[PDB]
Amino acid sequence: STIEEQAKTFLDKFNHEAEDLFYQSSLASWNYNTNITEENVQNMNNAGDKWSAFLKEQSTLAQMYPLQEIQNLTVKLQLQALQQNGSSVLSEDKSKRLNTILNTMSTIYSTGKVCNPDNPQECLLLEPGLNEIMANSLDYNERLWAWESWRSEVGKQLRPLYEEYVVLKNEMARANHYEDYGDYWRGDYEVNGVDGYDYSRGQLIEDVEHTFEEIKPLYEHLHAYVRAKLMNAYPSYISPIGCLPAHLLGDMWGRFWTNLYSLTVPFGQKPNIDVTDAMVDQAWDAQRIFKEAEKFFVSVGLPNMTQGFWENSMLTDPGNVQKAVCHPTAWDLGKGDFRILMCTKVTMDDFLTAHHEMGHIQYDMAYAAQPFLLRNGANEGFHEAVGEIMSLSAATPKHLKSIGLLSPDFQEDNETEINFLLKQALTIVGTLPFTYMLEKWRWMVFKGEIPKDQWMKKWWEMKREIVGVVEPVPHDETYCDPASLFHVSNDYSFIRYYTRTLYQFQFQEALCQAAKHEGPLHKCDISNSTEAGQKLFNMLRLGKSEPWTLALENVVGAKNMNVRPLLNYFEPLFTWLKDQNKNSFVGWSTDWSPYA
Amino acid sequence: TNLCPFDEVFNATRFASVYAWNRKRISNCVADYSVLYNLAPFFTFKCYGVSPTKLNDLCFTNVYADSFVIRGDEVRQIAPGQTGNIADYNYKLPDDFTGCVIAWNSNKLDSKVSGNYNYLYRLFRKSNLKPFERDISTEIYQAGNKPCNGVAGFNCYFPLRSYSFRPTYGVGHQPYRVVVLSFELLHAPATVCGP
Numbered sequence: 209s210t211i212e213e214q215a216k217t218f219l220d221k222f223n224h225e226a227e228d229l230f231y232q233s234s235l236a237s238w239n240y241n242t243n244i245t246e247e248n249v250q251n252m253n254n255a256g257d258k259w260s261a262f263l264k265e266q267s268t269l270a271q272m273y274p275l276q277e278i279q280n281l282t283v284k285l286q287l288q289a290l291q292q293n294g295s296s297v298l299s300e301d302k303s304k305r306l307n308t309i310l311n312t313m314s315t316i317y318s319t320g321k322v323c324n325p326d327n328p329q330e331c332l333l334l335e336p337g338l339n340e341i342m343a344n345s346l347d348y349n350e351r352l353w354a355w356e357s358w359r360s361e362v363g364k365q366l367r368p369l370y371e372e373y374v375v376l377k378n379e380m381a382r383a384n385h386y387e388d389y390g391d392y393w394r395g396d397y398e399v400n401g402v403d404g405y406d407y408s409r410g411q412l413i414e415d416v417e418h419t420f421e422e423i424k425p426l427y428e429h430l431h432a433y434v435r436a437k438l439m440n441a442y443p444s445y446i447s448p449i450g451c452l453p454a455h456l457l458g459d460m461w462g463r464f465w466t467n468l469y470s471l472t473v474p475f476g477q478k479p480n481i482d483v484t485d486a487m488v489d490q491a492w493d494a495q496r497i498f499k500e501a502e503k504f505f506v507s508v509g510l511p512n513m514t515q516g517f518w519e520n521s522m523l524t525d526p527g528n529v530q531k532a533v534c535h536p537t538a539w540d541l542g543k544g545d546f547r548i549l550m551c552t553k554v555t556m557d558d559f560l561t562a563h564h565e566m567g568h569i570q571y572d573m574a575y576a577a578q579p580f581l582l583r584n585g586a587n588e589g590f591h592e593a594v595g596e597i598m599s600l601s602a603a604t605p606k607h608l609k610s611i612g613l614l615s616p617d618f619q620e621d622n623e624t625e626i627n628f629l630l631k632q633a634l635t636i637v638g639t640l641p642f643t644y645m646l647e648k649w650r651w652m653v654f655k656g657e658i659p660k661d662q663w664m665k666k667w668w669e670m671k672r673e674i675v676g677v678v679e680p681v682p683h684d685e686t687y688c689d690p691a692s693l694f695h696v697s698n699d700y701s702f703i704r705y706y707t708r709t710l711y712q713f714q715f716q717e718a719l720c721q722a723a724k725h726e727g728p729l730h731k732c733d734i735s736n737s738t739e740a741g742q743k744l745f746n747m748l749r750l751g752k753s754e755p756w757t758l759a760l761e762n763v764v765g766a767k768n769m770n771v772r773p774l775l776n777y778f779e780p781l782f783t784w785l786k787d788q789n790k791n792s793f794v795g796w797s798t799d800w801s802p803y804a
Numbered sequence: 805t806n807l808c809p810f811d812e813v814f815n816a817t818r819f820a821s822v823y824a825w826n827r828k829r830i831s832n833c834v835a836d837y838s839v840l841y842n843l844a845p846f847f848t849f850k851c852y853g854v855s856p857t858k859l860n861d862l863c864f865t866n867v868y869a870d871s872f873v874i875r876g877d878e879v880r881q882i883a884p885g886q887t888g889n890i891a892d893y894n895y896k897l898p899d900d901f902t903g904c905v906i907a908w909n910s911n912k913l914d915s916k917v918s919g920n921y922n923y924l925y926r927l928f929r930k931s932n933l934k935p936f937e938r939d940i941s942t943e944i945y946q947a948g949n950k951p952c953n954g955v956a957g958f959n960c961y962f963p964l965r966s967y968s969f970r971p972t973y974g975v976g977h978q979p980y981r982v983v984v985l986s987f988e989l990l991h992a993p994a995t996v997c998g999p
């Protein structure tokens with residue numbers, strides 16, 4: 209019997225054992241997230257430990273089948289994923305050091321507190337304490353205090369850890385035959401051995417930098433319009449040619465500019481489209497919301513929710529006594545069990561979230577027939593892109609009017625059209641330079657291109673140059689500002705938010721063209737279009753089985769990430785911004801800082 | 805007026821694991837087929853060779869009742885000319901099969917919150933099964949080229965695996981009870997006619 213046939217048989221046994229053990233851990237995890245007790249924590253950890261220990265045993269056993277002697281690519285994908293899972297490449301001592309560091313950074317982030325000057329007993333955490341300040345406060349000093357205190361008392365704690373974190377992560381990645389830990393992360397996009405669809409890890413950097421260049425003009429005029437509106441609100445604090453102060457950007461890091469809408473709204477006398485009143489008027493509950501979201505997916509040819517979904521999901525807050533983790537999540541426990549955890553309120557925002565999360569469930573159900581190790585999005589940006597496009601259609605006035613939540617006597621005008629796109633751009637476009645510049649800095653740190661003594665120097669040189677954002681206080685190398693964001697100190701890659709954003713508009717443009725949508729892309733609703741649903745489904749049911757380049761081509765007809773649909777979606781705003789900035793300076797000078 | 809022991813087979817407390825499927829030979833009785841519709845809308849009743857449409861005016865030499873438990877997905881494999889872990893390694897119907905396949909969802913009985921590991925099925929075998937064959941061997945499957953020495957290890961797998969039935973599984977992974985009625989016609993007097 210060949211080594212490929214031995215691997216097929218081994219994978220057969222793994223698929224069974226993993227499916228059962230994974231289900232036990234997911235269910236135990238579910239029972240805690242919906243009913244927070246001490247016993248449910250123990251059951252979640254026991255079931256989790258058993259699953260982790262099973263994955264470590266099977267990772268080692270998988271490596272005893274060398275990849276070079278398998279020809280079946282579908283088998284080699286599964287074998288590689290199980291082999292690439294184990295960290296048994298670093299000595300037990302260095303593995304132990306690295307896990308302690310990871311735990312310490314995560315603990316510092318989640319329990320880091322800041323106490324108000326003049327009272328040691330009034331102390332705030334990041335959430336909800338400091339996040340409330342950075343998202344609602346208009347006082348320059350209060351926001352500057354929250355911004356600086358978070359970085360100087362929690363960030364400085366993370367600097368010595370992150371330094372050792374980089375060294376060990378590189379050692380682990382190098383010993384897995386990657387250039388560095390940044391190259392390891394880019395491994396998610398790699399494709400090999402499929403002629404016409406291959407993709408190298410280093411190609412991701414070039415495609416990200418090539419697509420980002422075509423985003424700069426839109427971002428420059430967004431940044432120019434935002435700076436002008438803030439300069440009116442803070443005339444003594446903002447230069448007409450300088451970068452935007454980092455603490456005046458709507459949250460702790462400026463990752464999203466969403467909360468600047470009140471100070472930047474183009475036409476403040478036209479109200480937003482809010483259907484919350486109409487939902488309460490019609491006595492909608494949570495079940496009605498998800499029932500409507502189910503109807504949406506059925507209208508395009510996708511299946512209805514399983515009976516187990518409605519029985520086992522938790523769609524409303526459990527109650528006062530029973531405490532829950534209300535973060536909206538879609539659960540694929542395996543063995544036909546799909547659920548949504550969500551503390552739904554009768555609001556437009558939760559209504560769109562229901563479509564977003566049920567968009568994940570549709571993805572999960574569609575690739576449930578794939579092998580266990582291939583039940584995932586095509587790459588790290590696919591799954592979230594699928595979720596987002598559902599809330600794009602679900603929110604249009606066209607879709608809202610057809611379900612009886614928006615009055616037929618409400619007609620769109622280009623002022624509310626511009627208000628919408630600006631609000632969208634503040635979230636979608638604003639995060640792109642933030643996301644690219646954060647990952648570029650980490651890619652360069654892992655590569656060794658940034659010495660330790662110039663970490664925070666290069667970080668703010670790249671914030672000013674790339675993002676047009678300037679620190680309000682000088683920061684030396686005792687700081688670790690990147691680590692003051694969750695994803696940096698909690699060891700998650702970050703470029704997925706950039707690729708997903710580009711994918712989601714490639715998807716929506718393609719599906720709307722299949723829906724024969726007439727008009728600007730941002731007004732499109734794929735509802736009732738079974739041809740659109742079929743195009744999407746042909747990619748969903750693939751899972752990880754096919755190269756992400758091929759899966760993308762199934763929907764959009766191109767093998768690579770493209771930024772033209774994103775620019776297409778925002779084109780009405782782009783022309784309106786350029787006309788707004790006709791007597792403004794566009795671009796920023798990096799030498800100006802608020803601390804003179 | 806001797807009534808055939810179907811309540812024995814269908815309403816049994818515990819069905820057999822499909823790898824060790826259970827056969828009940830039926831003879832010398834009146835077969836009241838037309839009264840079998842007493843389950844939770846029993847999800848399957850498909851016959852091959854004969855007609856279920858009130859064709860119990862027919863006599864057979866012996867009737868064999870085969871019973872086991874599989875998951876919903878696997879019920880499609882209890883039919884002539886199907887392949888899969890069940891039809892290849894546990895229970896195989898012949899190409900010229902004459903009889904009926906009855907199946908119904910038994911989630912309320914055969915599922916359990918901690919997971920019901922009573923029901924097993926065969927995952928590995930050197931070759932497929934001949935029609936109506938039964939293999940209950942617990943010999944370690946040699947997947948590699950080294951001998952196994954009767955213990956589980958690298959490339960040496962215990963040939964049987966468990967269904968781990970839980971009530972919250974999807975319908976495709978829920979337990980289904982199956983009864984396979986095999987009708988025999990030998991050159992011998994019919995002992996089984998059912999009015």
Ligand SMILES: *[C@@H]1O[C@H](CO)[C@@H](O[C@@H]2O[C@H](CO)[C@@H](O)[C@H](O)[C@H]2NC(C)=O)[C@H](O)[C@H]1NC(C)=O
Pocket residue numbers: 260263292293294
């Ligand atoms: C090895 O595989 C496991 C499969 O679960 C991965 O564990 C998950 O990793 C993601 C992202 O790091 C987390 O969101 C999940 O919560 C993790 N689940 C667990 C086990 O808690 C694990 O990341 C893989 N290891 C690597 C990176 O090779």
Ligand SMILES: *[C@@H]1O[C@H](CO)[C@@H](O)[C@H](O)[C@H]1NC(C)=O
Pocket residue numbers: 243245246247248530
């Ligand atoms: C919550 O968990 C406890 C065990 O810690 C259990 O006894 C209780 O029944 C659970 N409540 C609900 C509503 O599931």
Ligand SMILES: *[C@@H]1O[C@H](CO)[C@@H](O)[C@H](O)[C@H]1NC(C)=O
Pocket residue numbers: 216280281282283
């Ligand atoms: C790879 O293996 C799978 C499962 O055995 C099989 O269905 C598929 O056809 C194989 N592909 C090739 C190229 O042999």
Ligand SMILES: *[C@@H]1O[C@H](CO)[C@@H](O)[C@H](O)[C@H]1NC(C)=O
Pocket residue numbers: 512513514515
């Ligand atoms: C889903 O749709 C099918 C028919 O397409 C129907 O038979 C089934 O009962 C539906 N399920 C629910 C939960 O309504």
Ligand SMILES: *[C@@H]1O[C@H](CO)[C@@H](O)[C@H](O)[C@H]1NC(C)=O
Pocket residue numbers: 622623
């Ligand atoms: C809306 O469109 C019309 C087109 O003629 C244009 O004249 C008007 O200035 C636009 N209004 C805004 C606020 O963009």
Ligand SMILES: *[C@@H]1O[C@H](CO)[C@@H](O)[C@H](O)[C@H]1NC(C)=O
Pocket residue numbers: 810811814815839840842
């Ligand atoms: C099993 O029990 C039910 C109710 O007691 C009865 O209606 C049904 O006919 C029984 N099954 C058989 C095969 O007799």
Ligand SMILES: [Zn+2]
Pocket residue numbers: 564565568592595
């Ligand atoms: Zn999501």
